[PDB]
Amino acid sequence: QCGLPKLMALELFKPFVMKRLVDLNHAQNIKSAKRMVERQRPQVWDVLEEVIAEHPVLLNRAPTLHRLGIQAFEPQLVEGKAIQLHPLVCEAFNADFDGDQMAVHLPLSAEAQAEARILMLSSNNILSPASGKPLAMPRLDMVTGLYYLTTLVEGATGEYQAATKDAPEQGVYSSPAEAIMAMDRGALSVRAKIKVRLTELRPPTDLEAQLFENGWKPGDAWTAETTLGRVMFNELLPKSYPFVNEQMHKKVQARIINDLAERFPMIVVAQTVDKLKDAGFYWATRSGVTVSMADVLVPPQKQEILERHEAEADAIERKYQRGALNHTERNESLVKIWQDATEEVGKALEEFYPADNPIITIVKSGATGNLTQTRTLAGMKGLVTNPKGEFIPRPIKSSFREGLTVLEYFINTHGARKGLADTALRTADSGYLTRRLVDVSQDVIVREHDCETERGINVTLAERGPDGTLIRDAHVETSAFARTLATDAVDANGNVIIERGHDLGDPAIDALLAAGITTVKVRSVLTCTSATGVCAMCYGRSMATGKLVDIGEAVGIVAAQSIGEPGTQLTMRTFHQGGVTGGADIVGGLPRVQELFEARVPRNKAPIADVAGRVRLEESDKFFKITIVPDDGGEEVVYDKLSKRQRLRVITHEDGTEGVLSDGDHVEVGDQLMEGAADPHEVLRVQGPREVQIHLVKEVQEVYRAQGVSIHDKHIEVIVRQMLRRVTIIDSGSTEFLPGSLTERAEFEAENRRVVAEGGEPAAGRPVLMGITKASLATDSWLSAASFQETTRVLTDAAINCRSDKLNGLKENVIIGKLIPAGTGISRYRNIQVQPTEEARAAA
Amino acid sequence: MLISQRPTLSEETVAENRSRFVIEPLEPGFGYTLGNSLRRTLLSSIPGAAVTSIRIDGVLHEFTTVPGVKEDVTDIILNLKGLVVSSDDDEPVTMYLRKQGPGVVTAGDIVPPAGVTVHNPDMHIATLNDKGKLEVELVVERGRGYVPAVQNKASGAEIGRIPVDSIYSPVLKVTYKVEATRVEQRTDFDKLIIDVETKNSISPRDALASAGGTLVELFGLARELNADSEHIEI
Amino acid sequence: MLISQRPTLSEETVAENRSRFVIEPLEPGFGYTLGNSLRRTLLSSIPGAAVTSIRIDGVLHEFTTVPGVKEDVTDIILNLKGLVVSSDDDEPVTMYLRKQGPGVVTAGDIVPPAGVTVHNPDMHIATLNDKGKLEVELVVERGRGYVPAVQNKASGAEIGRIPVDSIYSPVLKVTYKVEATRVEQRTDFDKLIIDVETKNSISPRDALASAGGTLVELFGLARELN
Amino acid sequence: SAYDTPLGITNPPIDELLSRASSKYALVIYAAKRARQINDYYNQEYVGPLVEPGLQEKPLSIALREIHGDLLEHTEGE
Amino acid sequence: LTHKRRLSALGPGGLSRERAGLEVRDVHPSHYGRMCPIETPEGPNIGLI
Amino acid sequence: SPTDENGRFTEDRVMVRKKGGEVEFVSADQVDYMDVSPRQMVSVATAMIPFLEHDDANRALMGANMQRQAVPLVRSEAPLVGTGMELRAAIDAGDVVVADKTGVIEEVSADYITVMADDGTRQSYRLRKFARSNHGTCANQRPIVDAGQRVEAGQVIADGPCTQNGEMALGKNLLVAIMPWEGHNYEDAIILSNRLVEEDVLTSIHIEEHEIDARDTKLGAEEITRDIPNVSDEVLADLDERGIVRIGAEVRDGDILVGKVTPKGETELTPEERLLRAIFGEKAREVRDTSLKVPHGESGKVIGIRVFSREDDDELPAGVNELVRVYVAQKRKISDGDKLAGRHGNKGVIGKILPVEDMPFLPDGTPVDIILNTHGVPRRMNIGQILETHLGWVAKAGWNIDVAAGVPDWASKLPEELYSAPADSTVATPVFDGAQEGELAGLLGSTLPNRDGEVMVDADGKSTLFDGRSGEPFPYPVTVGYMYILKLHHLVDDKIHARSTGPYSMITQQPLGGKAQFGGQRFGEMECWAMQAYGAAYTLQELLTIKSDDTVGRVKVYEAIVKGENIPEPGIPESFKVLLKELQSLCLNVEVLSSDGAAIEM
Ligand SMILES: [Zn+2]
């Protein structure tokens, strides 16, 4: 639901209101109804209520970085002039109620209304499309309440205690109602430990297996050792959900919502999040979280730490005066010392604060903020940067609680002024990369259900390690999760756990870990053999909804948006015009991603082993020399111009710990000899199309992981697939392929198998790796080609061939004005015929 | 001054002893004025009988367990607190529960004195083991609301007289909420939804009637200061 | 144990327009809700009298000045909003305030018709110099709560009428306190003390009686059940 | 399944409708076509509503309730 | 009052329309005591005014 | 830097700025100069933010600029806690009238002040009343002197539009409780008591200036008349003989302000139009109505008319005869969506206005005016607002520091003038030299009791608030005080916009842009990407064609909606038609085929 102002709704629905006014005889003609609406007569408000009912409206807030920026809501009239927005969607819209505006659009046609009511409804978009994690979940205030409600504190009024002489158990209640009655009298605190008999809350599975070996049913009473607040919280969850009994940190709430998403339909999730919102607001009101300087505690160890580090700063100054240091080195040493001082002050402040202090309670619960802000507010501001972006040796030892001095404030203003321009400039590079990604993969749509391919990629789930418990792989949640199995998974006894083609959800991964199987084979977009687009089974689970992708999904644009949205968090090239070229220092961020997607030769190139064999290594004044002798092969291979500045690759086995690559080591084909970035073209030449795609995906995901961004591998795979779709012809046999021309691999294989009159006389060709730009700069459609290339040449070539265009390019359809060939626009659904059944029609 | 429209009270049945009452339309702001008062009146005004102490013969200080029965003393106390008892005595009354031999002992096995009625004889109390027996005496007296177990620190005539919490009020759970409704072109009017779950000894309708009577009774004191002072009228 | 003792209410004066009412004994936990309900009723639904519109001879709208008057029309209206009056008839009544020559015009210069009383003549309306002539006609009505100014077009009044905000509320400030009582040996029953201060229109006793009557009428709905 | 009564345009539940169509995209066109038929009938050879209509329910709501009621059939256009 | 005391870098004979890069619109140390570092419009003229 | 009575430094090392702008510590014998005062770096606006130490640079910037957007209220009120600059800035602005020469106030009135100087000269100062500023705000002045009073040279004798007693009064000081409340202040939203609406605390007067003129045309000169054709007497009842709305009449959107008619060209009536002329006896006339009307969503009372005409020798643009300007004034109260903010950069929008009985109230029964969420203070690093709250509470209720056993150790630095003060005693705290944390903490515990003799706020600045709705006391004390907040010029009344159908641009055929032109909202390429990602083909198609430059489809859809017909299907836009025609012109046999290899269609 959303609140829609009366005056705005009236203008939006004017024609409908006029129709209804004429229908009800309040106006004798369209002109009279128009005059009535314009002059806002008393009666129009009675018809507006009838018209507005059940008519969804789209809400949007530019810029629209991801598809959830436009969402449909059911409008209801409200007084005043400000739109009322549901809090849970703020995160989706990136909106705060401090002056933001929002735009409203009205679907007109029946198809548009159905699309808004089904595809775009807010309650249907709980999960983010980038990683499938819930997005419309409790936040800020709602967390603080739920964190307060479920907290357990020792010594609370009426808390449980054991039996004693002349006294049975003193804190046991016969039902939640009795506990609430006791709380109303002040005898019991909502956060006190109690033992309560629950009969409608399902016991924890481990407790259920013991207490009820025949399975728990409603009405079965069990004694739970918990707090009244936790019982109250657990009543908000679905009835069948096991009792949790835990303090609801934001991470725990995210876990619970994720679990609900898998096991229950979306409607139950929406109702649960609404109930959580209500309870969180109610208990955040009464959590007592307030701010005053009495609550802003300053650690008593700040003085000692500051003088202790001032002594070392004075030592640095003394050594500089003696001539043992240079200016820049002295500045760097002082920066190191004061960073250490700030770190220790932050640790002391974190230790000092009580667990129930509002300032630190707001942070620790995950509701808002981070400990750096708390340290700045109370501990000390720390170091600040020059206009050039370099740290000033002398830090701001004061804290905003104490109040900065004049000079400290003046030097602090530099970074504040810089950030305003930095934030504005950060969006340009992100938009550039996002446009590139959208261009390369706009028309990648799911065209068929199953391609019936046996190929796939191997993904690792865990390492059984040295202990008796295997450790879950950290990358499992974005590599194996949400895939579809290509082959059966068998336990240590050969028993099949999950069938082929099943979705590897969280329960599936947990069961796989229960059997201790470490690696599996999953179908991937990279290995999909579908001629056009990709098939649903290879793509697998839809991140936004959790079900298998429907035929017609616009997966390519979704992947492009998901990859491009977090581009602002990556590090970038320096924005200053002066200075030397920035390639000397590795800016491993958006520049690295751009380098990877464009398939350009890395500026930090490192060689790879063309042949598997043992290594003989030599050193020179400034160059390395690495030779590989193939153990099972013949002639050796030599690399004799590797710069000695680059370090040799480190291997570092668990306990062997070889460290830097040594002579006599063994290297397999595709291994990297020098630290740096492997050349994608060399990898393609040595290993082939399969390994270069894996290499590209690994390299991109490495940067995105290191920079703190979480994106599922399939989104990157969708983009990487488009880069390696052509094969260059070196020599043609019994077919009309011109030499040196680029042909689609599908057409190349099709022609090679079509040449059958004399069997096969294959034309020789090999795959070519292209950047996303060049890949996007080609198409099979002449109407689309006429918008990029010389229109006269394209039209002439199409005319002489008399070839037709099938309207599949999406970008081509918008020129025609014909609806896009994705989602509801594909012919599979556009031509649906609807007829009532004979048994249902009999009632007529 | 006449009210804009007379509010109405509708009822819905949610279970055998649970109901939901809707009061609407109310003048803007009166929903919260009525809801909390009704809830507190329901939970603290209606008198009723409850068990205030139980004495088991088989235990002096080993409260953890009682021989001949698998239930803990805590479980016995909880089950007895779940007992629904009514009386017309207005004074403490002693009730004896004695059973022998293996098998389930329930509230129906009780032998109430004259004037005392047990409304849920089918409630399970305990499961007696072989060679086992149960013998307890309960003190039942009337009251209002919820009174935490009174500690008989001065008890010299007995040491095994366990005190227990007394749920006197026949109403067990009440929860209220306030929503907005629209009459004419105004949407400030309030609607009060109050859900009441009561014991078996009284229906929710009777509890609400008694609460309303008590509240009218109490505000009559304020009204009688000057009965002719103009109020909003219905 | 069950007590048949009945609650009782006793009042005590603090000033001419302020009083304190003590209600005891009450069931434990029952005081705060009753006090809050009484406070809400007193602050929201106590009938009163207020001005609805004014007419000044030398003006057509409130965005102007009257010759010889220190205050502009908006200041005059904001000053008049502090006037508290008591009326006897539901239908609107008219009052006249006319003065000539220098001096301070206060609410005491208003001549009310039969059945209308002004309870704060010392309030300052305006100040006139030697050239100041002031003529004002005020409309007074009965009502309750806050009623925003009614548009002239809606009421059909002619130009020159200046509708003003109406505040029908004699109550000024209400609070409550709760304590324990020495009831027999139960000793946990509640004692409620509600402190009421009202504008000089009516005494606190009448306001409390009106609130009690409103609450009795509203809880009669619940009492209706058998 | 256990769930509170849906409110507004959430009735009938979305999952129950997806269980009665090939996909959400197919469901959109299915409901839109039925709503168009209902509106055309109300404008006066189509059958008209099959379920009891509300006071002023829109054609699309009637179509969705009919779909949930298993009162309609459709053939894939492919 | 604050409009009458503005110091505008943009205008004829000042800096070019398209050359107002992020470098000029910054707080140089010499601003101390003669130009306030805090007060500036939120519009596109941040630092330029 | 601390110094002795003689001026010598009392420290061995002092902080200094050197050649490169670097701040360092140097011996006491190396300094050459010092700053005259701590306020040297800040400007006039930044000098008016109390406790500026404790606010981050970004939030200080935001507060300084938001102080420039405050709208004058009907009655100004000086802040309880402020800075000494607010006085001087008020006088130097010039909006306050200052007596030039010492003398006696001979006569005082709303319109003018007459002063008799000691030397016998007489001065007359005319005050500007309800004058419209360049931005639509009211510039009303009012005198602050009494007849017969003596005024010294340079003394302020009349308050400006937004000053009280000759010092800046940009906003109002009101009671604030720092706590979340049912989520209505969630995400920087603000909750207000209904009192602020009933007492006109935040009400402001806004004046709009409409304009029109009659120009010479190729068919002749336009005319201003009351006889505009085809309007009922219900429409022009309030028009004067000249055809201009009478002063004092209230107007609403669509009402006529100035009646104007323009000559028309050839008529060439259709047969239907001729029949209508016949059946109503419409005598021929050659004028068309173009009367000025109140814009959409505007209303108020007419307060002035200014008319010019070249026949009176007034200068007018070439080819224009008469010009009329009308002033419409309205009294806007505070409403939902209006933007409020403090001086420290904390800003929000009113999400809810609660009845007075619902607001949390102090133990003595006083209901709080505003509620600010706790979660917005810490992470924004603008804790100076809490300092302002505490010091405002200390100022509202007087304080008295005991001196029976000597001055308290925390009161050593306080000047004697601050050892006591009555209620409502305004205080000053300069930006870089003001109240310290220890001094404020000590003062918080020295406040005077209330009317009943009980202290509402404890030594920590917190109080035990009651719940207005439930009536139960809140479980923990809540920070309470007085904050100075001001009404920004971002009111929702002039930001709401809507459009179903309206004007269209001739150059590109698309809807116009902006609220003034009654334009539509933009639908950028990113929105198209989002719609494609949803798979909502039909919605995107209708957005790009029906709701855009497609005249035939637009008219068809409007007709279908008004007549109740189901929306017709779109297809074959004009651009594709012309492209196909050009392709044919190039001898390229283009044709459209249905299905996977079927026949042509249309
Ligand atoms: Zn596939």
Tab-separated table of N, CA and C and ligand atoms in Angstrom, chain A residues 450-453 523-524 528-530 534-535 537-538, ligand 1:
chain	number	residue	atom	x	y	z
A	450	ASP	N	15.282	-26.393	-21.478
A	450	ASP	CA	16.448	-27.243	-21.270
A	450	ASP	C	17.187	-27.439	-22.584
A	451	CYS	N	18.513	-27.331	-22.535
A	451	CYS	CA	19.366	-27.596	-23.686
A	451	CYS	C	19.886	-29.028	-23.715
A	452	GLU	N	19.600	-29.826	-22.686
A	452	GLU	CA	19.958	-31.244	-22.665
A	452	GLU	C	21.461	-31.447	-22.847
A	453	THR	N	22.256	-30.633	-22.160
A	453	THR	CA	23.706	-30.746	-22.218
A	453	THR	C	24.242	-31.422	-20.962
A	523	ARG	N	25.733	-27.121	-13.741
A	523	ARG	CA	25.493	-26.520	-15.042
A	523	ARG	C	25.679	-25.010	-14.957
A	524	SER	N	26.197	-24.427	-16.035
A	524	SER	CA	26.538	-23.013	-16.030
A	524	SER	C	26.172	-22.394	-17.369
A	528	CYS	N	26.516	-23.715	-21.507
A	528	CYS	CA	25.236	-23.962	-22.159
A	528	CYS	C	25.415	-24.000	-23.670
A	529	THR	N	24.845	-25.023	-24.303
A	529	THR	CA	24.980	-25.225	-25.739
A	529	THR	C	23.832	-24.624	-26.540
A	530	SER	N	22.905	-23.922	-25.894
A	530	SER	CA	21.781	-23.336	-26.613
A	530	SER	C	22.283	-22.403	-27.706
A	534	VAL	N	20.114	-18.326	-23.687
A	534	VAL	CA	20.476	-19.372	-22.742
A	534	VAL	C	19.205	-20.090	-22.318
A	535	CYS	N	19.376	-21.308	-21.817
A	535	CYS	CA	18.244	-22.100	-21.364
A	535	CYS	C	18.044	-21.926	-19.862
A	537	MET	N	17.396	-24.094	-17.444
A	537	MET	CA	18.031	-25.036	-16.527
A	537	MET	C	19.480	-24.663	-16.243
A	538	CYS	N	20.234	-24.253	-17.265
A	538	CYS	CA	21.617	-23.852	-17.034
A	538	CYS	C	21.712	-22.611	-16.157
G	1	ZN	ZN	21.699	-24.896	-21.204
